[PDB]
Structure 1
Amino acid sequence: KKNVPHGAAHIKSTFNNTIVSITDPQGNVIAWASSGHVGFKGSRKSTPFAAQLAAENAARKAQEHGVKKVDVFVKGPGSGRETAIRSLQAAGLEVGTISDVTPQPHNGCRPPKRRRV
């Protein structure tokens, strides 16, 4: 295989789930673990417990590829931001730095309209 000394916790933290993609500094997701990856789907995909489970599974894969030092790259808001953060902290990946990597269309494109249920 290979070893990644420093990783990046690219957390696609959708309210649906926190896809914790660990990425080498090159910019390649060496592995990822989401709520479904642990086994959480539907509402359980969006439960806070799924967040630390996904983060911990990703960090276990990180150790499996010898990853210890990771800076945290959290995407948009979801379920279990700080939860996945201290999961990664408690799973062999120290926090390093936290960065809210969220897209900012500064009054740009048009989305769908809305939901009323």
Structure 2
Amino acid sequence: KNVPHGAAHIKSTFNNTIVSITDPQGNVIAWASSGHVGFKGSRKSTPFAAQLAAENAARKAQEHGVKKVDVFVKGPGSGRETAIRSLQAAGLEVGTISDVTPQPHNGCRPPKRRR
């Protein structure tokens, strides 16, 4: 309902860019993905899709009263910084950035190498 300070969790993969604006406790109040802002397939992986996703989630959060946001970015992607700029432009102001990508300690064998 009212959350002045929030957290923007950004999962930017090689196939999408999901953005979840949450309270600092982690309860989501808004989110947006490329598919939600009207994309499909491989265009979801573009930075522009992340621009729009971040913009839409930021607007839905502004509706709830979110001004300062701390970012928690994860995933290689290409629309990370694009989403940062989008949040900065969609009315919010970013306080802190953090690469929270999972770094396993050599556990859980990955999938095989693509040929």
TM-score by length of 1: 0.94
Contact 1:14 1:77 in 2 (8 A): yes
Larger deviation, residues 52-61 vs 39-48: 39-48
CA contact (8 A) 1:8 1:22 kept: yes
Mapped to 2, the partners of 1:39 and 1:114 lie a distance apart of 32
How far did 1:79 drift? 2.4
Residue by residue, what CA displacement relative to the aligned partner does 1:44-67 show, whole Å, maximum 9, x if unpaired? 111111011000001000100011
Give, in whole Å, the separation in 1 of the partners of 2:14 and 2:95: 24
Segments of 5+ residues of structure 2 without an aligned counterpart are: none
Number of aligned residue pairs: give it.
115
**Post-superposition, which runs of at least 4 consecutive aligned residues in structure 1 deviate over 2 A?**
none
Quote the Cα distance in structure 2 between the aligned partners of 1:37 and 1:77: 21
Q: Sequence identity, in percent?
A: 100
Supply the RMSD in Å over aligned alpha carbons.
0.9
Unaligned runs of 5+ in 1: none
Q: SS of the residue aligned with 2:60?
A: helix
Query: 2:113, 2:56 → 1: CA distance?
Result: 34
Q: With the length of structure 2 as denominator, give the TM-score of the two structures.
A: 0.95
What is the CA–CA distance in structure 1 between the aligned matches of 2:28 and 2:101, rounded to whole Å?
Answer: 17
| Equivalent-residue separation in structure 2 for 1:23 and 1:15 (angstroms) | 23
